[PDB]
Amino acid sequence: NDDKLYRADSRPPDEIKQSGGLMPRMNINLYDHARGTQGFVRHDDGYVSTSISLRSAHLVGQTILSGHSTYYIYVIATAPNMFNVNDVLGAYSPHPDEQEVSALGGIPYSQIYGWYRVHFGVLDEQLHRNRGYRDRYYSNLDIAPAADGYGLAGFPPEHRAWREEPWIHHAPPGCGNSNTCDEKTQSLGVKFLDEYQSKVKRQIFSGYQSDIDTHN
Amino acid sequence: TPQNITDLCAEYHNTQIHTLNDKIFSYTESLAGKREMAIITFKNGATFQVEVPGSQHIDSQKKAIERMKDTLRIAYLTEAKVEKLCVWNNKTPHAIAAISMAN
Amino acid sequence: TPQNITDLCAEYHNTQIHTLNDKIFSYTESLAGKREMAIITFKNGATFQVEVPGSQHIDSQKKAIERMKDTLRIAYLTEAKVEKLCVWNNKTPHAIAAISMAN
Amino acid sequence: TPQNITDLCAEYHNTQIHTLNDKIFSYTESLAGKREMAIITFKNGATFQVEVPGSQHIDSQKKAIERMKDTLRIAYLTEAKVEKLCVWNNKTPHAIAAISMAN
Amino acid sequence: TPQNITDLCAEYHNTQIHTLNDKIFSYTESLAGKREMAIITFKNGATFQVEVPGSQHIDSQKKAIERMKDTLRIAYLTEAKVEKLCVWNNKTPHAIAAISMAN
Amino acid sequence: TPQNITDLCAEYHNTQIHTLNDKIFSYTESLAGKREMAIITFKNGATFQVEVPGSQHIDSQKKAIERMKDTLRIAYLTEAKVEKLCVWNNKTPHAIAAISMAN
Numbered sequence: 188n189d190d191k192l193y194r195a196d197s198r199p200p201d202e203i204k205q206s207g208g209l210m211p212r213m214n215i216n217l218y219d220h221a222r223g224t225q226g227f228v229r230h231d232d233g234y235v236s237t238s239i240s241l242r243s244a245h246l247v248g249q250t251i252l253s254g255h256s257t258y259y260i261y262v263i264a265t266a267p268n269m270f271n272v273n274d275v276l277g278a279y280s281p282h283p284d285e286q287e288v289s290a291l292g293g294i295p296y297s298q299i300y301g302w303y304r305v306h307f308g309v310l311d312e313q314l315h316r317n318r319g320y321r322d323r324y325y326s327n328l329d330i331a332p333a334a335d336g337y338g339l340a341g342f343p344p345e346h347r348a349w350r351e352e353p354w355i356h357h358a359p360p361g362c363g364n365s366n367t368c369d370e371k372t373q374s375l376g377v378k379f380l381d382e383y384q385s386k387v388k389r390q391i392f393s394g395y396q397s398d399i400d401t402h403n
Numbered sequence: 404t405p406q407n408i409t410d411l412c413a414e415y416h417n418t419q420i421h422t423l424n425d426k427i428f429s430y431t432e433s434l435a436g437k438r439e440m441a442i443i444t445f446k447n448g449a450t451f452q453v454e455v456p457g458s459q460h461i462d463s464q465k466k467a468i469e470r471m472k473d474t475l476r477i478a479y480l481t482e483a484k485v486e487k488l489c490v491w492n493n494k495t496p497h498a499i500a501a502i503s504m505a506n
Numbered sequence: 507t508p509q510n511i512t513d514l515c516a517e518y519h520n521t522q523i524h525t526l527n528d529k530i531f532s533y534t535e536s537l538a539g540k541r542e543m544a545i546i547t548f549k550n551g552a553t554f555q556v557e558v559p560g561s562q563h564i565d566s567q568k569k570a571i572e573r574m575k576d577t578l579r580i581a582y583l584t585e586a587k588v589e590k591l592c593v594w595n596n597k598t599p600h601a602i603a604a605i606s607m608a609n
Numbered sequence: 610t611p612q613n614i615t616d617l618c619a620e621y622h623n624t625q626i627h628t629l630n631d632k633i634f635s636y637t638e639s640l641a642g643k644r645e646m647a648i649i650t651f652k653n654g655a656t657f658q659v660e661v662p663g664s665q666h667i668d669s670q671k672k673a674i675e676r677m678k679d680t681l682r683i684a685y686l687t688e689a690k691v692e693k694l695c696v697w698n699n700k701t702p703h704a705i706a707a708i709s710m711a712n
Numbered sequence: 713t714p715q716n717i718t719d720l721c722a723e724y725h726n727t728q729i730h731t732l733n734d735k736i737f738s739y740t741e742s743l744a745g746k747r748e749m750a751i752i753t754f755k756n757g758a759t760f761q762v763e764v765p766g767s768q769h770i771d772s773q774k775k776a777i778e779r780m781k782d783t784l785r786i787a788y789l790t791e792a793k794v795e796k797l798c799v800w801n802n803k804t805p806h807a808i809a810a811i812s813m814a815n
Numbered sequence: 816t817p818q819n820i821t822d823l824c825a826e827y828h829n830t831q832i833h834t835l836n837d838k839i840f841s842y843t844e845s846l847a848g849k850r851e852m853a854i855i856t857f858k859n860g861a862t863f864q865v866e867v868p869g870s871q872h873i874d875s876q877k878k879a880i881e882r883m884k885d886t887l888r889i890a891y892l893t894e895a896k897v898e899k900l901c902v903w904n905n906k907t908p909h910a911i912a913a914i915s916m917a918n
């Protein structure tokens with residue numbers, strides 16, 4: 188659907204275009220990402236957080252990015268790299284009041300609808316639309332369902348969540364049933380990131396090859 | 404001149420409009436002798452073909468056959484929604500005469 | 507030699523610019539004999555074609571007609587914003603003589 | 610006409626269906642004289658070629674061979690899951706006759 | 713043989729290297745008769761063309777002019793940085809002999 | 816018929832393998848007469864041409880040269896990891912006989 192998420196970020200539009208998108212600070216673990224300490228807005232352990240509304244992300248910047256003259260609130264389209272943190276971590280969600288939606292891998296540049304500017308903690312009335320934004324593609328897409336994230340929860344190997352529903356039925360080998368659990372959570376996330384990035388390259392590089400004219 | 408696919412399609416006998424509003428499920432392609440052709444499917448089992456260039460096709464049609472195989476391959480890969488296909492139903496699989504793509 | 511699409515279009519009789527500043531809403535392609543063409547629309551309903559190659563065109567234009575159909579497809583599937591079309595206004599739908607993309 | 614890739618393969622002698630369901634691991638292409646070809650591999654080791662054009666091929670096959678190499682490069686760069694190849698098993702490596710892409 | 717664009721440009725008389733180091737602001741192509749050309753610009757106002765094929769081009773150049781119009785269209789659409797253009801300064805706008813792109 | 820780029824390269828005297836495991840850093844393209852070519856580079860400084868269609872090419876080698884320039888252009892813009900290049904080490908800069916792409 189055409190839904191949209193929101194993220195305060197110190198990094199300006201030009202650096203984001205240069206990096207290919209909104210990248211995380213490679214460890215991939217959703218639990219560590221979510222409980223990570225927050226001078227810059229949650230982008231640790233292989234993920235980058237966002238918020239459900241434009242007003243809840245503005246507030247997020249106005250605590251974390253207090254002491255920044257200028258930051259940005261990037262408006263992001265929803266795609267199946269996003270995970271609802273409260274849905275995937277259940278009662279063990281460390282900061283449930285934040286209503287997080289974390290992009291495993293980052294938010295590619297095509298996924299970024301645009302960005303508001305913020306000066307001395309005041310929002311810009313209007314949006315800077317992104318020339319690389321893809322409205323049709325990303326509007327036929329949605330957040331990943333919680334079932335895709337339960338196996339990527341990233342709970343410690345002997346956490347009680349791994350012997351509890353829904354997580355037992357998605358639990359990586361070594362997680363409640365050597366670093367087997369830790370290495371598998373990493374690799375299952377590296378695979379999920381690899382297959383999502385495969386799918387976006389399918390979308391964008393196929394368009395770049397809608398060039399071809401066999402007959403000519 | 405027709406302004407859309409439905410009206411273009413109705414100029415031709417033994418055609419019919421298929422309204423799918425879905426991305427192509429699978430794309431097949433062959434270079435085997437006498438079978439230099441393409442074949443798409445959709446979720447629901449619907450199967451269609453770009454015909455082998457033969458005796459039913461004029462020269463301007465052979466150019467556009469090669470183009471349709473380009474369009475269809477790349478439309479499959481982009482996962483573009485296909486509104487409608489005008490097809491010929493005197494063949495099996497139904498042979499594509501036109502396609503329209505839209506959100 | 508012209509510097510932009512607006513000045514190019516002003517060199518021809520029966521042409522006019524149609525500014526769209528919008529991506530293509532739909533792409534329609536046909537290999538039906540004597541309707542080997544493309545038809546694009548936009549969200550506002552505006553409709554254009556790439557003519558079927560006929561006697562109205564010179565030799566060098568044929569290569570360019572096929573090029574333009576390539577452009578419209580890649581423009582459609584990459585969601586590129588179309589700036590302007592130069593079109594012949596004495597066909598229905600209006601027939602694309604040129605295209606600019608920007609912004 | 611055959612309804613799908615498996616039917617198409619059953620029409621020729623010296624052929625078989627290879628069922629991959631994986632992206633292409635490696636795309637190789639050569640312009641070196643008398644080795645004008647492609648070669649693809651998958652992570653199970655399976656290696657295939659698009660044969661250099663020769664006297665085994667009829668004239669209509671010339672175009673489809675060029676398309677197929679295009680198709681394999683597009684498929685590689687897009688990491689498109691290849692469902693099945695129809696392959697001539699009388700060559701080493703097996704020579705690609707047709708391809709289907711799904712999921 | 714020349715190693716880079718600047719060395720290649722230096723072989724031909726009546727040329728100059730423009731360093732742009734920017735993606736292309738606009739791409740424009742025409743299929744209208746006697747103006748079968750492309751025209752690109754940059755944010756700073758620099759305009760360039762790929763010339764209409766004519767008697768100044770030998771036959772080897774013909775397929776390269778078509779390759780260059782492909783390159784400029786997909787350069788624009790990808791938002792790829794054009795480092796430099798080698799251009800004939802004797803035409804208005806300056807005609808493109810070559811292009812380099814760098815990250 | 817070889818199953819990979821290393822063995823294919825070894826069939827020719829006057830070739831050698833570079834293994835880059837790296838994307839292309841720059842793509843260059845010329846339509847200037849008698850230098851209808853492409854040039855690529857890498858981070859490590861390494862430079863390669865696709866030769867101008869000249870004297871020491873056949874007929875079917877002319878088509879594969881065009882396909883190779885297609886390959887390098889799209890590889891450059893997709894940031895495709897080039898595994899290896901088999902190159903004619905007696906041209907300066909070395910000219911690409913083949914490419915392999917994995918990763």
Ligand code: NA
Pocket residue numbers: 188189190264265266325326327328329330
């Ligand atoms: Na969405």
